[PDB]
């Protein structure tokens, strides 16, 4: 009868390492192994009251009294060294492969039909359409999340470390490659076939990614925050691995899989991140609404159960949602 699997979860592919942030001068790019680390340090601030007060408590004698006592926070920040201008971000990405084989299913016929459908998908077309888009989000350095805007020239640079040595190197320039269109270059197809053979499974792929962003002398980089769970106050603690400021290994990699252009009301508003009920919090709302039939769950249950194969512009989405992993069972 092939009912839906009660418990189903998937191991991910495309793992990113943790991101490291170093600092230096732009002319010393090609010898930047021993650049010092962008350290985190504490500073103090002093705010005011800048929130929308309600209609009741808009008394004149209370607002000046509330701002007479300000709120003295203690913020952590990260600045580049005052003699350095170029921010170096280094992280390594490994490509696992075997995207169909799940982690913990229940029915054997569900698992076998799932692997059969995924084998048909890899048989008719390659992963080439789902690898000319991951290679873009390595090229135009979206993984620099807020450090990208207002940068002078963003040179990203990617190596193939098969052994301890490098196999074949690549340099791009992340502003020649736009943040919206997916072009077709001669050195985004030697990279895309590499991630294609890594995801299909015909080898092992480990990629070293460094990204130099030109921000300026003494400027302010942005690493990712943490939690301030439970006076001695503090706010906005950044995340540093061994006192070197760091982007998380899921904020990086979240920019690896903003691939999804195939979704309704697409008004040229750019790709979003792939998700079941494909949603972004920054836009507030959730696209791929389940009342539409262009979801993920009701796209898998109409392809592994009733075999109604959707358009190839959604089979590029379902497989990519399988590549990020996740839980998919009736929890």
């Amino acid at each position: 009868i092939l009912s839906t699997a009660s418990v189903l979860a998937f191991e991910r592919k495309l793992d990113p390492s943790d991101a490291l942030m170093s600092a230096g001068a732009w002319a010393q790019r090609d010898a930047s192994q021993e650049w010092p680390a962008v350290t985190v340090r504490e500073k103090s601030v002093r705010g005011t009251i800048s929130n929308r007060l309600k209609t009741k408590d808009r008394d004149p004698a209370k607002l000046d009294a509330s701002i007479q006592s300000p709120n003295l926070q203690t913020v952590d920040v990260a600045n580049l060294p005052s003699d350095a201008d170029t921010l170096k971000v280094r992280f390594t990405l490994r490509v696992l492969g075997g995207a169909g084989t799940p982690s913990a299913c229940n029915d054997a016929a569900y698992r076998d039909k799932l692997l059969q459908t995924v084998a048909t998908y890899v048989n008719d077309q390659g992963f080439a359409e789902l690898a000319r888009r991951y290679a873009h989000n390595l090229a135009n350095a979206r993984f620099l999340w807020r450090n990208r805007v207002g940068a002078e020239a963003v040179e990203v640079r990617i190596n193939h470390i098969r052994q301890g040595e490098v196999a074949r190197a690549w340099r791009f320039d992340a502003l020649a490659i736009g943040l919206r269109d997916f072009k077709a270059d001669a050195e985004l197809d030697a990279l895309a076939e590499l991630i294609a053979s890594g995801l299909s499974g015909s080898g092992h792929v480990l990629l070293e990614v460094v990204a130099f962003a030109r921000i300026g002398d003494g400027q302010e980089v942005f690493p990712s925050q943490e939690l301030i769970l439970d006076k001695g106050q503090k706010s906005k603690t950044l995340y540093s691995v061994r006192d070197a400021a760091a982007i998380h290994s899921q904020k990086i990699g979240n920019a690896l899989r903003t691939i999804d252009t195939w979704y309704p009301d697409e008004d040229g508003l750019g790709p979003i991140a792939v998700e079941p009920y494909g949603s972004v919090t920054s836009q507030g709302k959730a696209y791929r609404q389940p009342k539409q039939k262009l979801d993920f769950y009701t796209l898998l249950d109409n392809w592994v159960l009733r075999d109604e194969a959707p358009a190839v512009e959604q089979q590029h989405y379902v497989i990519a949602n399988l590549i990020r992993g996740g839980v998919f069972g009736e929890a």
């Binding site: 929130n51 929308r52 939690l227 301030i228 769970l229 439970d230």
Partner: protein
């Protein structure tokens, strides 16, 4: 595992570690490392029932170590 307020909303969610959000000023105090719960729209406040404590209101009133959660939180369903 508590005795909440009089909200009869739905199968609530609860945690004890609580951070304060500032961005998005219609929701305050977003909850951290949160755990699921089910009372399945029971009548009174004490029904929390994580894995073991459903009946025995005397034992529930004995279970006052981490109790009296206020409930007024990010959502009428979601509790403290």
């Amino acid at each position: 595992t508590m005795s909440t307020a009089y909200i009869i909303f739905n199968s609530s969610v609860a945690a004890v570690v609580d951070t304060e959000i500032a961005n998005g000023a219609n929701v305050t105090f977003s909850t951290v490392t949160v755990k699921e719960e089910i009372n399945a729209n029971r009548d009174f406040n004490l029904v929390n029932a994580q894995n073991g404590k459903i009946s025995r209101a005397k034992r529930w009133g004995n279970e006052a170590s981490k109790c009296e959660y206020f409930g007024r939180e990010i959502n009428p369903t979601e509790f403290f």
